[PDB]
């Protein structure tokens, strides 16, 4: 009675947990590889 039925969890908290976790992991990995060290053109010349 006080609790949400089964399939409330499966249908609504797979999205609400999985999407937030996915965003917070994917952002970490994209920002890591972006702010990493690799080939660039010099600021003092190209610009």
């Amino acid at each position: 009675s006080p609790w949400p039925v089964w399939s409330g969890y499966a249908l609504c908290f797979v999205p609400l947990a999985a999407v937030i976790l996915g965003f917070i992991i994917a952002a970490r990995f994209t920002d890591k590889q972006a702010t990493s060290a690799y080939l660039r053109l010099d600021p003092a010349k190209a610009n």
Binding site: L11, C12, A27, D31, Y38, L41, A46
Partner: protein, 306 residues
């Protein structure tokens, strides 16, 4: 290794039909490049064309029968004409009178064939030029929802009448009728995920386009050249977003984000539509069992009545 010239001009079946290229002019001044150029026709190309022309012909002739072959009336009521699938009686039976629901079946069959052959064309032309085949798989992701709407959902319900009806206003009516039938379609959770992904997709598109146009001055538009060596433009674009929202991505990741958002939209949509008729008959009655409906014991209805 790969000759582009022999892939731009090569007779027929293995070549392009419109050999002379043309210029649009006004497109050149506002859209960048503005040449129309040749279009390649292969084996898979001719099939989709003829099947689509067959389905469209079937549908267009059946419009005329409804108006009595009157071109004045035909032009007046063109936007609300439609052809509808069979009624609930003889739900899945394929033997129905032509005017009642028989014309719909042939048209939808030829449409299916055309769609699949166009997919094959995409895949083959992608392999021929030496580029990857990601576009074909994305088109397959969208075809998933397309096939759930027209084939998989009417099947497993017993009625061909669940599918839409090949009309300009018929598709809006289909959307409305399905949402009303299940009841409070807003509460479907996979519908919520699909809306999340769709609005995220539009967000990403607007942002990527806007920032790239803003930093165009330093030749940041050529995303292929920048992937090998990041110039000043890409360096500025990273710094702008790093200070605003605290993190950023280079030119290679942002396109992964784009692809995956666009595809998750359609996949979650298909999964969510399929479940409405079979597992969960009433969506709002399900939401109140999941404890996510606002109590609203006494609303103020003075706003809604005029």
């Amino acid at each position: 290794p790969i000759d582009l010239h022999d892939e731009e001009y090569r007779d027929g079946l293995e070549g392009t039909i419109a050999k002379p290229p043309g210029h649009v002019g006004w497109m050149q001044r506002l859209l960048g490049e503005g040449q129309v150029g040749p279009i390649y026709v292969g084996l898979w190309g001719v099939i989709s064309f003829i099947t689509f022309f067959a389905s469209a012909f079937i549908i267009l002739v059946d419009y005329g029968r409804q108006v009595g072959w009157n071109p004045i009336i035909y032009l007046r009521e063109f936007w609300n004409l439609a052809v509808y699938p069979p009624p609930t009686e003889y739900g899945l039976s394929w033997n129905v009178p032509w005017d009642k629901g028989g014309a719909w079946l042939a048209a939808t069959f030829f449409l299916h064939i055309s769609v699949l052959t166009w997919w094959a064309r995409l895949y083959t032309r992608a392999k021929a030029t030496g580029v990857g085949t990601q576009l074909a798989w994305g088109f397959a992701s969208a075809l998933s929802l397309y096939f759930v709407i027209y084939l998989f959902h009417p099947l497993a319900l017993g009625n061909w009448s669940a599918a839409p009806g090949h009309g300009f206003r018929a598709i809006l009516d289909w959307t409305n009728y399905v949402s009303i039938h299940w009841g409070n379609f807003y509460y479907n959770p996979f519908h919520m995920l699909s809306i999340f992904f769709l609005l995220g997709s539009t967000l990403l598109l607007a942002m990527h386009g806007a920032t790239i146009v803003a930093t165009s001055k330093w030749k940041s538009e050529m995303e292929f050249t920048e992937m090998m060596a990041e110039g000043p433009g890409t360096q500025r674009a990273q710094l702008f977003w790093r200070w605003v929202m605290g993190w950023n991505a280079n030119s290679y990741n942002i396109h992964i984000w784009a692809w995956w958002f666009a595809a998750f939209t359609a996949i979650t949509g298909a999964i969510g539509l399929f479940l409405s008729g079979t597992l969960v008959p009433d969506w709002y009655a399900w939401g109140e069992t999941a404890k996510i409906v606002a109590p609203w014991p006494n609303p103020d209805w003075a706003q809604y009545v005029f």
